[PDB]
Design brief:
part of a larger assembly; 4 chains; A mainly alpha (about 100); B mainly alpha (about 50); C mainly alpha (about 240); A: about 100 residues; mainly alpha; C: about 240 residues; three-stranded antiparallel β-sheet; two-stranded antiparallel ribbon; about 40% helix; extended; Polymerase acidic protein (chain D); RNA-directed RNA polymerase catalytic subunit (chain B); Polymerase basic protein 2 (chain C); Flu_PB2_C (chain C); Flu_PB2_6th (chain C)
Chain lengths: ~100, ~50, ~240, ~90
């Protein structure tokens, strides 16, 4: 399936204001800031076809580029990810016949 | 306010909040933490010279 | 080696050389003084306001488990998050020599907890600095006892910083119990009860007796040792047993 | 006085959530967005010195420029006004 069904949880925003209508990126950021308990991630089940360090680097890059918003004079509306080697391998941009 | 050092059990969101929360949850005797890092204040009239 | 080349290029100018050659070391202090808050809560709102040394890179990671940076590269610039991280999970040294010179504070606490207040009414230096020098600065003693042995025994190889230990020892070695709590016992119109509960010198430096030596010469070398030594922090003099 | 004391009223934001920490400009925008009833403005008591149409045009300009942020793709943190004749006269640039 496209998204897993039975094994999912949610990070609730706990009743935003009635006048609040904003971009989903800021809602996701506000949902993320409500969780403490991050640790060093590590693989528990290999994919047996591919490279798992690419997955680790992708997750770490997601976290870093989500945290590094404040280094901008103007606040953007959407986030464009930097084209990195692990991301390029994951998206299959070099396997074009 | 000036040193961005609030108590660990507070809802104020700053750039130092995550580390203070982790330190607060890690320790056991919370009365021994300095005010500089999420600690209570024990100063009074009798303690002004220590 | 920077020391000698700074000496060399500092005396190149005639103006900065006349001063260094004319005045003597007796006049050191009189020339040291000829030097010419919203500021604090304005650089704490910007990243990397603290200065550190280069070795912090090897011990402290660049980013935390959330993704926040801790230091940046051009003595580098660091953030208080690095200090908090160090206080959270860093190398730990459990030495007992930290309070080795801090007792002069501790009895104060010991004199505070072990006391009873009661009711309230509303009625209307050289002799120490010499031993400090021989304890903290063995290589810079002057041309001059059980306490000295005890101090050398108890804190021989566990020093932290010469200036701090010197200040603490000077404060410790140089009634006061009632005076120290004057702000709590006495008021403007009220009073509160409370209960605490050697060698000899033949002459100046002589070049025939080889090069000079340091002060640490317990080895008399056949008890003759007509030796040139730097006494105090000034010139070189000859020494005989 | 610098600000009037007895005659002031406030446009509240109706109990923001405990997680709400942000730029004062967006807080002001949110507070202004909760009010309805604006009409065509007009002068009620002249200053008997200076030009009042400059004040009216300044109010219209600040309203328009507060309503003209959605045309930008990289919405800013602070708002800078445009140097016009009315603002130049009001601020005494000459």
């Amino acid at each position: 399936s496209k998204f897993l069904l039975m094994d999912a949880l949610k990070l609730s925003i706990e009743d935003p204001s009635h006048e609040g209508e904003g971009i989903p990126l800021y809602d996701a950021i506000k949902c993320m800031r409500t969780f403490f308990g991050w640790k060093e991630p590590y693989i528990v089940k290999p994919h047996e076809k591919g490279i798992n360090p690419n997955y680790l680097l992708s997750w770490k890059q997601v976290l870093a580029e989500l945290q590094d918003i404040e280094n901008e004079e103007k606040i953007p509306r959407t986030k464009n990810m930097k084209k990195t080697s692990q991301l390029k391998w994951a998206l299959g941009e070099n396997m074009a016949p | 306010y000036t040193y961005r050092c609030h108590r660990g059990d507070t809802q104020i969101q700053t750039r130092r909040s995550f580390e203070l929360k982790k330190l607060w949850e890690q320790t056991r005797s919370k009365a021994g933490l300095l005010v500089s890092d999420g600690g209570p204040n024990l100063y009074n009239i009798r303690n002004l010279h220590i | 080696m920077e020391r000698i080349k700074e000496l060399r290029n500092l005396m190149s100018q005639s103006r900065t050389r006349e001063i260094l050659t004319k005045t003597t070391v007796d006049h050191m202090a009189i020339i040291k003084k000829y030097t010419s808050s919203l500021r604090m809560k304005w650089m704490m709102a910007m990243k990397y306001p603290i200065t550190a040394d280069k070795r912090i890179t090897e011990m402290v990671p660049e980013r935390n488990e959330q993704g926040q940076t801790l230091w940046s590269k051009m003595r580098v610039m660091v953030s208080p998050l690095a200090v908090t991280w160090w206080n959270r999970n860093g190398p730990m040294t459990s030495t007992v020599h930290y309070p080795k010179v801090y007792k002069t504070y501790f009895e104060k606490v010991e004199r505070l907890k072990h006391g009873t207040f009661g009711p309230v009414h509303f009625r209307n230096a050289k002799e120490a600095q010499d031993v400090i020098m021989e304890v903290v600065f063995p290589n810079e003693v002057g041309a001059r006892l059980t306490i000295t042995k005890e101090k050398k025994e108890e804190l021989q190889d566990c020093k932290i910083s010469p200036l701090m230990v010197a200040y603490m020892l000077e404060r410790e070695l140089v009634s006061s119990v009632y005076i120290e709590v004057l702000h709590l016992t006495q008021g403007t119109c009220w009073e509160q009860m409370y209960t605490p509960g050697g060698f000899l010198i033949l002459g100046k430096e002589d070049r025939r007796y080889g090069p000079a030596l340091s002060i640490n010469e317990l080895s008399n070398l056949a008890k003759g040792e007509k030796a040139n030594v730097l006494i105090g922090q000034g010139d070189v003099v000859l020494v005989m047993k």
